[PDB]
Write a protein that binds this DNA or RNA. Structure first.
Length: 686
RNA sequence: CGGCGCCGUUUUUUU
């Protein structure tokens, strides 16, 4: 296919005789079948056409051409020889396609690909990987590459993470010696013989969990049983943490201080010791676990007929993921091969799990439709996620987070359980329930948004959460830029929004303030994850006291409010840390993958800077005007609509400077560049 | 409304 590179001595001889030319090759970023090099003497560049006549040279390499020319030798390879792209199947190879079309397509051997990739390849259809080119044979149109696992260098990533953690007050040290003495000290733990009498034994039922692929601990489980008259019996089963954490111990004090678990991209800073978090409390499959359950009989539409709260002993059958449950929903009348599913206990079959998934999905769909008919608000934006290596636990790939039917299925029943427990504990203890609320947005900014939308010709209503949801729903269909424009408008509409708060009901004396604005419900609380939240442990204690298992808590409403305030602060800090870790690893990706060119839509304009939204990578970056080669810049607010005009510094002294006006919803082109020595990156408007 | 004329502000589920 390609021509063999020439000998160095003949290249030197040809340079001496003068019939060969040197230069730097540049490839057209739009028509990839042509490239050129600057002329040594003439004004017109030397042209090389096609990819064969380019002869495996990449963009930026210093080459020798022979005369209409052709590359015959490369002196110094200046290109990084690293690319970012997507994997797919075509056997021993997988295909890797880069985002830059000046780089060829690369074979990656299957043993380098992720473990789950061969069985469920469609899970990795939009996951972004780095591949380094190690060869390019003469007889192949495809380079041979190596997939780059373990994004970054641990020598430099860890100090950055430590600084991020330290600037927010996250305690990440080891648990004390007195904390570990409050744990059970025995041999591999077994349930005491005196618990089987006071609990409900559900070890014979079919119960399972659905959680992310990178799940660390498991907090909740589901079961569904079809009844004889067309109804269903559905149960939600929560790990029993308050049994292992006695009130007033060093373990209790440390968990109260940390108040939440922090989930970094590469590790976790937990709230409880890894003996509990990983072995005794986590609902691992095929082990007798103590849980606390809520059980309903539901009509096929989702109506509650009777309700039961209790303590149970369960034994999970399988561990599903959000991509495993989705394959069940989308195949209602066909067998899923076991090779595409996780292991299951011999006591239960795969069909008894598939039928339960479908029967839960139908009810969840009905509940979701009715909830959005009753006037609920959903205000979600884009987010970014990373995959991990099974052998070591280091990130290697990066994709855009997707919300699907499995997520909605789990969310509906978690919401229903949370509302049920909220009502139960609020009836039981009016002055000590730990609830969660959300106030209505700010009036101030609303006028500015409605005026701006009227001027831009976007009819948006803000009288109610349901009207606002409908207004955001109807945004010029689902064209290429319709989704981006919806993203920008959602980002603008989420600015007047306020923040949700934990609180103790014994201090708010107005029933109208208990409401949750975005969900449009009179009462709410958090109940379904006590391992990674301490408010959940508190409500578990409260409900156990409500059912008569223990005595009423001695803790006061003032102490409950103080702990709620602490939980609010730590949840805020955890959110910021979890965002900054994703920013850090995307900076690592940019640094190792070179500068990335893309298209962006302006989300905001400031006096000397403007935010953009990188459409290809789903990230938001701010561009500063002082960092560009501009003759000048000016800012003008015409009514309520802002505008920024830029006058480029001309490259030469005969033509007039170019003026470019940028306004919101406009389209620009940007380049992402890695900083010299740091894990940061910048956006350049050129 | 705040912070220093210039900047800051979100809901839900799982981990």
């Amino acid at each position: 296919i390609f021509e063999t590179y020439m000998s160095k001595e003949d290249v030197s001889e040809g340079l001496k005789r003068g019939t060969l030319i040197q230069g730097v090759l540049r490839i057209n970023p739009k028509k990839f079948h042509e490239a050129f090099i600057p002329s040594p003497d003439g004004d017109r560049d030397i042209f090389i056409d096609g990819v064969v006549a380019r002869n495996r040279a990449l963009n930026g390499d210093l080459v020798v051409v022979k005369l209409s020319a052709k590359v015959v030798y490369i002196l110094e390879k200046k290109h990084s020889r690293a690319a970012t792209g997507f994997l797919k199947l075509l056997r021993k190879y997988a295909l890797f396609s880069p985002s830059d079309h000046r780089v060829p397509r690369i074979y990656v051997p299957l043993k380098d690909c992720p473990q789950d990739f061969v069985a469920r390849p469609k899970d990795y259809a939009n996951t972004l990987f780095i591949c380094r080119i190690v060869d390019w044979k003469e007889d192949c149109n495809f380079a041979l590459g190596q997939l780059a696992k373990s994004l970054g260098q641990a020598g430099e990533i860890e100090p950055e993470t430590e600084g991020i953690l330290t600037e927010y007050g996250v305690d990440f040290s080891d648990f004390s010696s007195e904390v570990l003495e409050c744990l059970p000290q025995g041999l591999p733990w077994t349930i005491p013989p005196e618990e089987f009498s006071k609990r409900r034994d559900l070890r014979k039922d079919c119960i399972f969990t659905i959680d992310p692929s990178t799940a660390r601990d498991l907090d909740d489980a589901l079961s569904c049983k079809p009844l004889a008259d067309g109804n269903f019996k559905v149960g939600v089963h929560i790990a029993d943490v308050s049994y292992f954490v006695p009130e007033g111990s060093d373990l209790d004090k440390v968990a109260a201080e940390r108040a939440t678990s922090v989930y970094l991209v590469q590790k976790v800073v937990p709230m409880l010791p890894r003996l509990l978090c990983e072995e005794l409390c986590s609902l691992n499959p095929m082990s007798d676990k103590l849980t606390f359950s809520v059980i309903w009989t539901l009509t096929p539409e989702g109506k509650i007929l009777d309700e039961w709260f209790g303590r149970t002993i369960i034994r999970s059958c399988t561990k599903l993921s959000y991509e495993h449950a989705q394959s069940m929903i989308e195949s209602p009348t066909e067998k899923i091969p076991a090779k595409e599913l996780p292991p299951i206990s011999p006591e239960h079959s795969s069909e008894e799990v598939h039928q339960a998934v479908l029967n839960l999905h139908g009810i969840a769909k009905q509940l979701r439709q009715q909830r959005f008919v009753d006037g609920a608000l959903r205000l979600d934006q884009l987010k970014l996620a990373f995959t991990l290596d099974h052998e070591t636990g280091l990130p290697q790939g990066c994709h855009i987070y997707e919300y699907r039917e499995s997520n909605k299925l789990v969310e509906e029943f978690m919401l229903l359980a949370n509302m049920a427990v909220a009502h139960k504990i609020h009836r039981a203890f009016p002055e000590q329930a730990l609830l969660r609320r959300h106030p209505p947005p700010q009036t101030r900014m609303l006028s500015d948004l409605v005026e701006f939308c009227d001027q831009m010709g976007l009819p948006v209503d803000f009288s109610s959460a349901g009207a606002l949801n409908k207004s955001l729903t109807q945004t010029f269909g689902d064209d290429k830029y319709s989704l981006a424009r919806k993203e920008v408008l959602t980002n603008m509409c989420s600015r007047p929004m306020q923040m949700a708060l934990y609180f103790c009901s014994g201090l708010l004396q107005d029933p109208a303030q208990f409401r949750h604005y975005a969900l449009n419900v009179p009462l709410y609380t958090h109940f379904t994850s006590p391992i990674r939240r301490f408010a959940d442990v508190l409500v578990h204690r409260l409900l156990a006291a409500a059912l008569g298992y223990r005595e009423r808590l001695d803790m006061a409403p003032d102490t409950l409010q103080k702990q709620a305030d602490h939980c609010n602060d730590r949840r805020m800090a955890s959110k910021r840390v979890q965002e900054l870790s994703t920013s850090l690893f995307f900076a690592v990706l940019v640094k190792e993958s070179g500068p990335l060119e893309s298209e962006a839509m302006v989300m905001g304009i400031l006096k000397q800077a403007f935010d953009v939204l990188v459409l290809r990578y789903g990230v938001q970056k701010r561009i500063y005007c002082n960092a560009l080669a501009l003759r000048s810049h000016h800012f003008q607010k015409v009514g309520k609509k802002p505008e920024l005009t830029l006058v480029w510094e001309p490259e030469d002294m005969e033509q007039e400077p170019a003026q470019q006006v940028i306004t919101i919803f406009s389209l620009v082109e940007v380049v992402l560049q890695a900083e010299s020595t740091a894990l940061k990156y910048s956006a350049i408007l050129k």
